[PDB]
Design an enzyme around this catalytic site. Sequence first.
Site, PDB file in Angstrom:
ATOM      1  N   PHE A  78      -4.801   1.310  10.475  1.00  0.00           N
ATOM      2  CA  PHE A  78      -4.347   1.650  11.850  1.00  0.00           C
ATOM      3  C   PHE A  78      -5.307   2.569  12.618  1.00  0.00           C
ATOM      4  O   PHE A  78      -5.161   2.667  13.863  1.00  0.00           O
ATOM      5  CB  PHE A  78      -2.937   2.238  11.792  1.00  0.00           C
ATOM      6  CG  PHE A  78      -1.941   1.319  11.134  1.00  0.00           C
ATOM      7  CD1 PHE A  78      -1.446   0.202  11.800  1.00  0.00           C
ATOM      8  CD2 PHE A  78      -1.491   1.571   9.851  1.00  0.00           C
ATOM      9  CE1 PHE A  78      -0.529  -0.639  11.181  1.00  0.00           C
ATOM     10  CE2 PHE A  78      -0.582   0.716   9.237  1.00  0.00           C
ATOM     11  CZ  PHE A  78      -0.123  -0.401   9.901  1.00  0.00           C
ATOM     12  N   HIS A 188      12.184  -0.628   6.355  1.00  0.00           N
ATOM     13  CA  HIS A 188      10.723  -0.915   6.451  1.00  0.00           C
ATOM     14  C   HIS A 188      10.333  -1.528   7.794  1.00  0.00           C
ATOM     15  O   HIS A 188       9.591  -2.519   7.813  1.00  0.00           O
ATOM     16  CB  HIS A 188      10.270  -1.774   5.264  1.00  0.00           C
ATOM     17  CG  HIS A 188      10.801  -1.253   3.975  1.00  0.00           C
ATOM     18  ND1 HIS A 188      10.553   0.047   3.569  1.00  0.00           N
ATOM     19  CD2 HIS A 188      11.659  -1.788   3.070  1.00  0.00           C
ATOM     20  CE1 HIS A 188      11.167   0.258   2.410  1.00  0.00           C
ATOM     21  NE2 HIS A 188      11.858  -0.850   2.079  1.00  0.00           N
TER      22      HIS A 188
HETATM   23  O1  LIG Z   1      -3.525  -5.172  13.495  1.00  0.00           O
HETATM   24  C1  LIG Z   1      -2.872  -4.119  13.263  1.00  0.00           C
HETATM   25  O2  LIG Z   1      -2.146  -3.500  14.041  1.00  0.00           O
HETATM   26  C2  LIG Z   1      -3.066  -3.512  11.901  1.00  0.00           C
HETATM   27  C3  LIG Z   1      -4.137  -2.700  11.598  1.00  0.00           C
HETATM   28  C4  LIG Z   1      -4.268  -2.176  10.273  1.00  0.00           C
HETATM   29  O3  LIG Z   1      -5.200  -1.464   9.884  1.00  0.00           O
HETATM   30  N1  LIG Z   1      -3.257  -2.535   9.409  1.00  0.00           N
HETATM   31  C5  LIG Z   1      -2.184  -3.343   9.685  1.00  0.00           C
HETATM   32  O4  LIG Z   1      -1.365  -3.659   8.830  1.00  0.00           O
HETATM   33  N2  LIG Z   1      -2.110  -3.801  10.971  1.00  0.00           N
END
Ligand SMILES: O=C(O)c1cc(=O)[nH]c(=O)[nH]1
Length: 224
Positions: A78, A188
């Site tokens: 993220f 979750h």
């Molecule tokens: O595309 C996303 O928002 C995203 C980024 C990331 O690092 N991990 C995830 O699970 N989603």
Amino acid sequence: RPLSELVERGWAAALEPVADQVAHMGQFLRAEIAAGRRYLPAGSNVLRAFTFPFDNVRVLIVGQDPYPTPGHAVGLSFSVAPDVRPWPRSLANIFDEYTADLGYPLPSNGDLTPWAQRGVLLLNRVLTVRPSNPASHRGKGWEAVTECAIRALAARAAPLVAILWGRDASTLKPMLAAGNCVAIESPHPSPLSASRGFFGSRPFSRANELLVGMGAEPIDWRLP
Ligand SMILES: O=C(O)c1cc(=O)[nH]c(=O)[nH]1
């Protein structure tokens, strides 16, 4: 490079069982470039979540795949580089929950490096992606690496709070629930769940309540 060269000491020992798998993924990425396909994040950032001390991890945040957009993925789930604007939708949603839960103002940028320094492991189950092709490296060999990482984390005689933001609870809970001092935040919702369960999930304050309840120090979540 052998594991001891690529990741922090504790992680190199934790990941010894999948050292051949880690070698193999390096060969896969080289074969992708030879095949005329690209990957993200940058090679230097792929194992970045494992360059922060294995013994000091207090919180696990699980994602699924890196950002598919060029210039977003930096090897912590993220996170984006400090010059990335606007934020990806998932991150904008995380930061709205951050302000609501914790009462802090909006972060100055999207760089979650301070969380990583403080023992928040920002782990994607799959550590690479082909740019502009979401989830394109599923089943290429990362799942076994990130499973070994999570089972090793769960096996420590140490506290852990798991936050699942990649929606795969029925695959992830068995890897964790086999631990001694692991609390899983349920339910979750993922950041894109938004107002259908993510906003008001209080993931940050709840992780600190759970760490303090297991006799550990809380995380300072505050970003610049
Ligand atoms: O595309 C996303 O928002 C995203 C980024 C990331 O690092 N991990 C995830 O699970 N989603």
